[PDB]
Amino acid sequence: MNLTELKNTPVSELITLGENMGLENLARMRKQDIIFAILKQHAKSGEDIFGDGVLEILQDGFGFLRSADSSYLAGPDDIYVSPSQIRRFNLRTGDTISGKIRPPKEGERYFALLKVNEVNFDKPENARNK
């Protein structure tokens, strides 16, 4: 579901949510990995999961979505964001965005943005040129 919502669930509430999905014995798991599990099990079950916040660009040409503070680096529960994604809808660091998420390939480690639902209080496109 919404990653920020997952974090809104205390580690114990995240393990009880996994138990509801069959993931039991998570008491030994940290809120980070337990959320990643709720993403794999609610997705397997076919539920939708999405991320949201304010993007952060990286000199490397890719960036991550997350809260509004900075910290300079990313975070484990943040969101991965490719350039084609930023470039494709004309985004910017600090931009406000919301969307669905999906895992890339074995080189996943962080989930990646997948579909855009909202961006800079505007649609992911336009038609005036400037």
UniProtKB/Swiss-Prot annotation:
Keyword Nucleotide-binding: yes
Cellular compartments per GO CC: cytosol
Domain Rho RNA-BD, residue spans: 48-123
Superkingdom per UniProt: Bacteria
RNA-binding 1: annotated segments: 61-66, 78-80, 108-110
Keywords: ATP-binding, Helicase, Hydrolase, Nucleotide-binding, RNA-binding, Transcription, Transcription regulation, Transcription termination
GO molecular function, one term: RNA binding
Complex and partners: Homohexamer. The homohexamer assembles into an open ring structure.
Assigned protein family: Belongs to the Rho family.
Protein name: Transcription termination factor Rho
Record organism: Escherichia coli O157:H7
Protein encoded by which gene: rho
Full-length numbering of the shown residues: 1 to 130 of 419
